[model samples]
Target: SDEKIKTAHDLIDEIIQDVIQLDGKLGLLGGNTRQLEDGRVINIPNGAAMIFDDYKKYKQGELTAESALESMIKIAKLSNQLNRHTFFNQRQPETGQFYKKVAAIDLQ
Candidate 1:
């Protein structure tokens, strides 16, 4: 980690952005239809949904500081995994989009 200090909410935002970036890349590849090593197919929507679900619980006090930190670590690890997906061999990027808040629906 950097010398800079950050709040739990800041970590959550970073995790969400990373996940969203992964989803965007996957969509560009094939609308987020990817098959795992076990031959199980996973869609991008689930990725985002999982985070949002945990986010809801975290806000509701179902998750605490330590637990939230763990989730953030896991989410970051997953981002790395998705970034190295085989599809990236053909296409991908090293950075992602940035935003203040990721709304479920874009009114703009």
Candidate 2:
């Protein structure tokens, strides 16, 4: 018997908690848009907001766990993207701290 499905459930729950933690740090930057080291501005909140309703649907059992896991995976990738500028740009020492906190959340 494979335990991978159980593992997926565990990871999904963990990712939710981890994302909540990062949400606060992102909010501290004081706006919805963030400028990266290369001077390109990105709207961080909108990207995550794109999937919230789908996540809600999944929570309500309107979608399958398999698809929900896919959403979680996308979130993991997004976290890495956020961590990159947080580490390299280093404009704010507090944002840089986001790198340390999120770096350990590997679902791969």
Candidate 3:
């Protein structure tokens, strides 16, 4: 169980890393078109709106980006251990799975 949890943690880190890499590769272009809390436009990667959703959910609990990221990294690590491996590929997928995952993470 600990190993599974560790794996989840590792996968979460991997997910964050992957998202950052994708953003870097895409020049970190694109952001939330609509304004969110306090009229702030979350600087999410292209096609990543779900990340905002997650952020909002966590923010409701007074969680900061740092905490959110930590949580995401944990989820990713768990997902990896579960054999989800949805976002572990180096080559970008053309189907937008990468974008979806990144968006789902609420990265800005």
Candidate 3 similarity to native, TM-score: 0.31
Pairs that collide in candidate 2 are none
* lDDT tens per residue, model 2, 11-102: 55664454344354355244365443356444434434444445666768987777866664566466557756535454444434533433
lDDT of each: 0.50, 0.50, 0.46
lDDT of 1 by residue, 1-108 (tens): 233565666666665555545654345244345443356444444445555556666768999865865664576456556655667454334331212122211222
- Cα lDDT for residue 62, model 2? 81
Q: Lowest summed lDDT over 10 consecutive residues: which window, candidate 2?
A: 98-107
Estimate candidate 2's RMSD in Å.
9.5
lDDT of 2 at 16: 48
State, as a TM-score between 0 and 1, how close model 2 is to the true structure: 0.44
TM-score of 1: 0.47
TM-score of each: 0.47, 0.44, 0.31
- Give all candidate RMSDs, comma-separated: 9.8, 9.5, 9.0
Model 3: colliding residue pairs: 7-77, 8-77, 8-78, 11-76, 11-77, 12-73, 12-76, 12-77, 51-103, 51-106
Candidate 2, residue 90: Cα displacement in angstroms equals: 9.0
Off by over 4 Å in 2: 1-6, 25-44, 74-108
Ranking by lDDT: 2, 1, 3
